[PDB]
């Protein structure tokens, strides 16, 4: 019986490095939400005070999370 | 490489007729429908047991899905 990677995932440029602790994971619910987040994290010079992909990532929650409080 | 990916070769929609491949195999039809709602219609139709005493049934008739649109072979051979 003993005998790919992440799906819909956009890493940040600074994940697991020298400034790893100051990065966020914006986990969204589906893919239309990730379309909104991709629209909004790419305000280039129209939002100098907002975040971008230098310190933010994206991943989808797949709908409804499985609970672990009753499968353990 | 084939043996690594032979497990994914070994799920089609197929209702076998009772007499497919036997002594009366040439008496049998294969009603190749186009989707799954069509198979719902055909399975409704082939089970009129006494409302259609002169009709067909699954003793000599099968069903299979054509999967939408058939690939052509004339451009791929």
């Amino acid at each position: 019986l003993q005998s790919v990677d992440v799906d819909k995932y956009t890493r940040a440029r600074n994940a697991g490095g020298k400034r790893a602790q100051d990065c966020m994971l914006l986990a969204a619910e589906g893919d239309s939400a990730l379309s909104l987040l991709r629209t909004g994290l790419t305000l280039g010079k129209s939002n100098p005070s907002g975040p971008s992909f230098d310190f933010c990532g994206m991943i989808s929650l797949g709908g409804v999370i499985m609970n672990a409080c009753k499968k353990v | 490489l084939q043996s690594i990916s032979k497990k994914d070769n070994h799920v089609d929609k197929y209702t076998r007729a009772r007499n497919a491949g036997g002594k009366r195999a040439q008496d049998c039809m294969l009603l190749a429908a186009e989707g799954d709602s069509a198979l719902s219609l055909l399975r409704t139709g082939l089970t009129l047991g006494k409302s259609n005493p002169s009709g067909p049934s699954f003793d000599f008739c099968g069903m299979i899905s054509l999967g939408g649109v058939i690939m052509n072979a004339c451009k791929k051979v």
Binding site: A28, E29, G30, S32, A33, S35, L36, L37, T39, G40, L43, S46, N47, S49, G50, P51, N67, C69, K70 | D36, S37, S40, L41, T44, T47, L48, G49, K50
Partner: protein
């Protein structure tokens, strides 16, 4: 990591309300906060209300405003010692904790907690669980459990209201996705489109063992069968529905839909809080759902039992009249209330405190073949066959198991291994309650009910017998008859008053010389001097939803528009004869109404017997035509 601070969230608006002119909207984060804000208003015909299901409904000029202030709206979670028991209650493997918490409503939020959250931007996990998750679980109970008056859920009540309105003009059929778009547009359905189409499909099915015994719609196409449990219908692209118009006409009377409390969504009304049918339709069908905390399961009753009980309650010269009222006062049972055996050929037995339903086999030793001819209630065929195929203790006696069933009648054929009828009886012992073959071939089941409904004004209610549901249902229909008769009485007096001034204006238009006058001001002045009553023409012709105090409070506060939009077509003598005879019919109807408001045992007791007979003949006609109403 929840202690040190690792788990965070944004906080976006669910509702924005835009005023004309102002470039800042009013934002709401909860639905009941919007409803409480909106019902306090006086006119909402210069505002626009937007509902945002999902983040992708936000267009560009507001995502820019949401992301100029991104770090301003991220909140961090803290937890205390009062939180571990709440996670075990809300998400643990036992429901009794969840039942006893989930009966009470949501507890609102104090000013100190709200100022602390909106100032320092940290959220207690327990304070999140005792508002947001509890509000979710109460809303899920409301969506997934039926009311006990009409017997239907909230989605199916939206489907019924939008289907009465959709097939109004002519009853032409539409595709399921087109009708779904209609009922999601006009009934303010705020969810996805796939589950609505699934509910429209399953709200129209009719076969032996379906959920609904008396469906709202006639279904035109392929709507699935017994043999897969209705799971093999067509796609909504293919199949169609139309309204079963005479059953909906007789069961849900149209002049009673004006008198019900309605669900207001986004400012304007959507559907009733509940329908009140002529018969107790909550106990007349099948059903089995889970929900949050509770479970819903019903088995339908006989039609003749329910007709006997309602006709014994209402009709005054039935022999079981006062004795049934005694039994309602003391909650004892007299007339029997059996399960329904319609469209089922097997047999039903009561052994203690439960009912059991049995199949039907046909033993043969000439060819060692048992011919199964029926399954128990609500048992699909292919699931039964695969269940009888997986069990290894039963497979040791059979050679081959073959199906020959039609689309509406079971006929399964087993084949036994040679000389194996004898070894079944010592292996599968015969009790008094079931046979050895029925132990062998899985041919009985128990009818075990969970009568957990929702009530008006929300919240769970839980009954112990079907008699309790009937006794809780009857007074609502009683008072609704009293309401419709008093409303009709007021409207008839006011319409007599209206048309017996049209008659005298037609008689005096030549002496009055209306063409001589200048505009509506001088005409209304010269009509006020000759003894014409000022009336409110719109409220008299169409009293849509007006209560009787509203109907006699703004009726005498109008103008002479009733008399001024008269066409010259109707100044003729045949029109005079027509209006005088319809005034005579209206005042005869008024005498009949004020005589109906007095009778025994309560007002409106003969009209309800007539409607029982009408619903009965419509059900009989529908059962004969295979629910096609040809």
């Amino acid at each position: 990591l929840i202690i040190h601070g690792f788990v965070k969230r944004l906080l976006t608006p669910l509702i924005r309300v835009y005023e004309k002119g102002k470039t800042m909207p009013v934002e709401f984060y909860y639905e009941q906060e919007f409803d409480a804000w909106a019902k306090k208003q006086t006119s909402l015909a210069n505002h626009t209300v937007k509902y945002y299901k999902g983040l992708a409904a936000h267009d560009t000029h507001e995502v820019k405003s949401m992301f100029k202030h991104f770090d301003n709206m991220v909140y961090t979670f803290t937890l205390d010692d009062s939180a571990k028991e709440l996670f075990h209650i809300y998400f643990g493997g036992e429901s009794e904790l969840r039942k006893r918490e989930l009966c009470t409503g949501v507890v609102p939020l104090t000013e100190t907690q709200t100022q602390s959250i909106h100032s320092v931007r940290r959220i207690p996990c327990s304070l999140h669980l005792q508002v947001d998750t509890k509000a979710y679980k109460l809303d899920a109970i409301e969506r997934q459990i039926p009311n006990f008056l009409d017997g239907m859920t909230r989605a199916r009540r939206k489907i019924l209201a939008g289907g009465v309105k959709c097939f109004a003009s002519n009853n032409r059929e539409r595709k399921v996705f087109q009708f779904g778009g209609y009922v999601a547009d006009h009934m303010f359905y705020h969810h996805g489109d796939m589950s609505l189409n699934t509910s429209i499909i399953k709200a129209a099915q009719y076969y032996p063992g379906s959920s609904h015994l008396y469906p709202v719609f006639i279904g035109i196409g392929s709507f699935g069968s017994r043999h897969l449990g209705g799971k093999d219908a067509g796609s909504p692209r293919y199949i169609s529905v139309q309204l079963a118009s005479e059953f909906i006409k007789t069961m849900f009377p149209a002049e009673d839909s004006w008198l019900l409390p309605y669900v207001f969504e986004d400012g304007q009304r959507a559907e009733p809080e509940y329908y009140v049918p002529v018969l107790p339709l909550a106990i007349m069908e099948y059903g089995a759902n889970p929900s949050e905390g509770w479970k819903y399961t019903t088995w339908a009753r006989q039609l003749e039992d329910i007709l006997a009980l309602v006709r014994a309650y209402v009709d005054k010269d039935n022999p079981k009249h006062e004795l049934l009222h005694y039994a309602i006062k003391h909650k004892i049972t007299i007339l029997p209330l059996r399960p329904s055996n319609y469209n089922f050929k097997g047999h039903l037995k009561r052994f203690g405190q439960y009912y059991y339903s049995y199949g039907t086999y046909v033993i043969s030793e000439q060819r060692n073949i048992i011919t199964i001819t029926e399954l128990p209630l609500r048992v699909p065929t292919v699931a039964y066959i695969e269940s009888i195929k997986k069990s290894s203790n039963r497979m040791t006696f059979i050679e081959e198991i073959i199906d020959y069933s039609s689309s509406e009648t079971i006929e399964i054929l087993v084949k036994l291994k040679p000389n194996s009828l004898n070894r079944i009886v010592e292996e599968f012992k015969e009790t008094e309650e079931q046979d050895s073959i029925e132990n062998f071939l899985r041919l009985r089941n128990c009818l075990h009910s969970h009568l957990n409904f929702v009530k008006p004004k929300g919240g769970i209610i839980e009954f112990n017998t079907y008699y309790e549901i009937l006794y809780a249902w009857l007074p609502y229909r009683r008072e609704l008859y009293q309401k419709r008769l008093m409303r009709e009485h007021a409207v008839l007096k006011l319409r007599i008053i209206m048309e017996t001034a049209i008659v005298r204006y037609i008689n005096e238009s030549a002496e009055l010389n209306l063409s001589h006058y200048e505009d509506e001001k001088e005409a209304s002045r010269i009509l006020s001097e000759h003894g014409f009553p000022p009336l409110n023409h719109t409220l008299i012709i169409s009293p849509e939803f007006a209560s009787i105090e509203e109907l006699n409070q703004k009726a005498l506060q109008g103008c002479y528009t009733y008399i001024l939009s008269l066409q010259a077509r109707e100044l003729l003598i045949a029109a005079k004869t027509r209006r005088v005879e319809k005034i005579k019919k209206m005042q005869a109807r008024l005498d009949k109404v004020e005589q109906l408001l007095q009778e025994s045992p309560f007002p409106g007791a003969s009209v309800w017997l007539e409607e029982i007979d009408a619903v009965e003949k419509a059900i009989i006609k529908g059962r004969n035509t295979q629910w096609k109403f040809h």
